[PDB]
Amino acid sequence: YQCHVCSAVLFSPLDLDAHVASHGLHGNQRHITEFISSWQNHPIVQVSADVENRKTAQLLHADTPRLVTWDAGLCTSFKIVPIVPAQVPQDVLAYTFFTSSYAIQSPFPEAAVSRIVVHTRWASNVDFDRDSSVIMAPPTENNIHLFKQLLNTETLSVRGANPLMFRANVLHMLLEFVLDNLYLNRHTGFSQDHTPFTEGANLRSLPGPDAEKWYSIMYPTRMGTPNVSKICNFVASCVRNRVGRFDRAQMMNGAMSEWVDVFETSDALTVSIRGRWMARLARMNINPTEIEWALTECAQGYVTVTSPYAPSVNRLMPYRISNAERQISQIIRVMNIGNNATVIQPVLQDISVLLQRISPLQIDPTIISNTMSLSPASSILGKLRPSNSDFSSFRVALAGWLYNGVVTTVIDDSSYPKDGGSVTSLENLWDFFILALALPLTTDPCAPVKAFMTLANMMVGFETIPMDNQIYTQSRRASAFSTPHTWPRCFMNIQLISPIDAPILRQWAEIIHRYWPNPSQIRYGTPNVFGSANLFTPPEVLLLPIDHQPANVTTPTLDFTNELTNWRARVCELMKNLVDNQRYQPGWTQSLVSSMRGTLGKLKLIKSMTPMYLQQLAPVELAVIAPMLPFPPFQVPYVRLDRDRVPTMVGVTRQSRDTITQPALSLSTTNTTVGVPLALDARAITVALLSGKYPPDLVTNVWYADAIYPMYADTEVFSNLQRDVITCEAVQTLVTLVAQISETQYPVDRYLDWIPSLRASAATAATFAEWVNTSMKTAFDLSDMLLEPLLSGDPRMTQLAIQYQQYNGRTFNVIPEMPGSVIADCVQLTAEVFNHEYNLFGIARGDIIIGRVQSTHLWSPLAPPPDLVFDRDTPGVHIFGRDCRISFGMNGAAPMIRDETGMMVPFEGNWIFPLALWQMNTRYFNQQFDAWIKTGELRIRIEMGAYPYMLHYYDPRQYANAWNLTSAWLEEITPTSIPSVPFMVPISSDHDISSAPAVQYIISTEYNDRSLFCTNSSSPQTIAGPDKHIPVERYNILTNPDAPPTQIQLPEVVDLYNVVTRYAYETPPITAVVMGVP
């Protein structure tokens, strides 16, 4: 067998059918990427790293999130639960079809009282549980556990919540609510219907064994109007033709559509969240042609990639992002580094080994011995020690070019001559040769001055140079010049060194100024589809500390046009001039001029090929490797000798630009150099740079094709792009969310402030951000890292930015313009809806009035009439502040409390506390006020703003008394928590009843009876108690005839019957056919 699209060899017909799906052909899922070369038989597939028992398949060690996940159940997130059940006699009990009895199935609970609750994903099949659920029990249970999970570790009670953390808990709850509905609606099949009420209407069928149990919940219109009741006349009011399927795509797939619009039970909030998520994902769509272009361009032209496919529109490959998100991810990783060398070591080591494995260069020190054959020759042989074969220092010096801004590589301290050195010593002369040859390959910006001052130290007693001050001396160690502020004026201005006094030293200085290698820059990667994470350089540029030229192997070894070869020749010439006249070497009794000259000539004319390599083939390998790295290159510019542009500090900023706060310098600024310093071996660098060669039969096209194929077959660029998406999104949402519970210059709309809270400090904001971070990681199935560096000290940030500075005070500041974020948009939307539908999440606004009210009236204490409520406008009201002090009576007088105006008042009338007063003096105020509240004439309006509640229904035809609950609540209040407020609601009945007294003490101060759905749903009408017909405002497209099928009044009231759009996509793996180039 074989596939004529990609030319792969298969074995079974089912194998071919499963294989063509990766190209887009149908027929009649474990792989991430699938490559194949054209010059050999060796495919390379790539499978996830967590799976077991892989049969010779490479791994994807990235930490890619789970973006695309499907949902096949209902789209709703608000369920209706009956509270007080009830059976009622009926007139029509079932239907008849010639012999058959079909039971009457009602879309809503047939109970005496039923109200809406919030169980996220109560009816939904999912292929990946995101596992961040906001599950709410009915109000008759206790839901206090939803508001005491974030900043309640210490707690004076187990069933109490701290009222100073209500806003933080509600914000986290809304974040989880949004973060749980991030699924993707699915396209399960349909089925016709010929019921007399839903005739010829395609109905959607959930997956699973049963399918007709959900047809009564999905479609409230299907039930007829058999009986005379509230459900019956509601269904009578509703219109018919809005049911089932609305329309379907024109592109079919077999006999099945691509998308479809269906009327069914849902909510506008979840449908809007999922629609925005769908738009966000579709905005990231990529194209196999563009992947082809990107890979064939990143390969530098040694290999051409091609990826064929068939015409399809339902293909989804979310991989496209903007440069701002890449830059923000880069800033987060730079903060992660945090002066910890343990997170820099593996990167440089592994890049070193990768270069060593894909490079053509071979390093054998036998060339030096063959060219060589106190004996200066033997001296330099013993000082280079060619028998050693560890050249990790060379490869790491090359790999450090990509990471100029984080790690700076300097020559070791042990390489410099002992005790400063002297030119009268052969050993010190050879030390200088090795050091001077090794210096130009490091990223230390003071390398030229170290090179100069080495010889300057060695020349003491023979040559002098002008000094800058009276403190330092010419014999200052060359390794102590580690900063730009140290460069000698004589070295900068070259004409100060007098040629009649320091001849050799001025020669060395002129050689440094003229022949030091010149920086350059090469362009890498595909900035059109992979973006670019370059912060201080343009989008497609790779800076290099050496010049680079086009490649060819047929170029002469001795080529003094090459910078490094020219440098070796010049250094050898100067050491020759130093040794020529023996002016600097007294004490040498025998003349070693001939030996020194011969050895220096051999060193200069050695047939090394490392200069050729570094000039031609090293930059192309760096550019071929760069776009595939996990931590992309972070570079700061290379300034050859211009001192006023030497970068000396790199910081990171969190606060906005128009604000003054604590100066909180990042930890990256404490480095003496620009980055973390690592030392290198000058001897090893010199040996590797002095003895190298190619294989005798290198064909560069074949070599780089065979070396590029197996390492693009294990690329994780696409996973990294998705993770950068998620990182930028998390940063934006964390800023937008932490700006709500503190004081920050990032103003976003402040939708909820009636929920009380405190002005969170650094520690509280940090723990809150930790909960946010952990929730997002749990939702997207990440485990490595996301937002952790931001949590290290004062997370109350406004925006990220990174900047370095030059020596002369100039600073360059970069600020990625962060785009919109779908998660933060959805969170703000859900908060804006919470502002109106707070009751459904088990919360009430306003405050409660504690006062004895005995009567036989049935008025539902969550909807108080105007008589029982008082406020500041109410005359004869006493407002109390923190200075409330009780003084007992004497000899029959009455106790008195301290008013806010200053007067004393007895325990009578209407009062107004803050909740803080009681929460402070609970154990005292309770014992002082209990009897007066119970049997006296005392009434208090504790003002709270927001509070969770709990309902206690009773029979309105028997005695009741709420004191045993009220006093329990008042006892259980504590300085750190508060239990849910207990209410005492009567039960409504469709028949007349007797009336018995009822003594209740707690009532609200405004309408909180909004979660109530319907009462006596299966009867014709309610006669006593709270009355509530079915809310037609939520069933708008059904009840309202002249309403467009997509209209939603989402901010005010959320609808429970909408138009959902179901999808059915295919997400193929990354396919490529790597061809070779002649």
Partner: protein
């Protein structure tokens, strides 16, 4: 089709004349060695988390000074470098270089987010500061 989770949360066709599998060519760069190097270089970065709080609000990491923390991380990196190179002494050292770097700080678990030392963790401080002002019943 249920996909598991990686972490834990809240819980007459004749043979046509072209095909063959004889394996005539072998790559000179070495496909296995290149794949091994790519596997080593593909790994994500270590997570440097000490200094950040956990769920209860207590910072993570040891209680050692900042600068000594940086020094210990440096010479541990040196030891790991030697182990990777398979020698006795690392040739590319991160510690004891020629650069004077006595001001370098490395994030540790000694300092909280406010800016104070945590010799008594945040939860303990909160608990005792709250317990200092509770009250009982009279009798």
């Amino acid at each position: 089709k249920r996909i598991p989770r990686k972490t834990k949360g809240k819980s007459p066709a004749t043979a046509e004349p072209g095909t063959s599998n004889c394996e005539h060519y072998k790559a000179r760069p070495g496909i296995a060695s290149v794949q091994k190097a790519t596997e080593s270089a593909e790994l994500p970065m270590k997570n440097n988390d000490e200094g950040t709080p956990d769920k209860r609000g207590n910072t993570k990491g040891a209680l050692v000074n900042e600068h000594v923390e940086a020094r210990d991380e440096a010479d541990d990196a040196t030891k790991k470098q030697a182990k990777d190179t398979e020698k006795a002494k690392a040739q590319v050292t991160y510690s004891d270089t020629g650069i004077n770097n006595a001001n370098e700080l490395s994030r540790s678990g000694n300092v909280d987010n406010e800016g104070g030392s945590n010799q008594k963790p945040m939860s303990t401080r909160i608990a005792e500061a709250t317990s200092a002002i509770v009250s009982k019943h009279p009798a």
